[PDB]
């Protein structure tokens, strides 16, 4: 739910683990 991950996804990938996109950022729960 929150961007914890650090990590944006225009193209649409995150690599930190249990990390979901949600364009154009990324959430970990």
């Excluded at 961007?3 to 970990?28: A, D, F, N, Q, W």
């Amino acid at each position: 739910g929150l961007p914890i991950c650090g990590e944006t996804c225009l193209l649409g990938k995150c690599y930190t683990p249990g990390c979901s996109c949600r364009r154009p950022v990324c959430y970990k729960n």
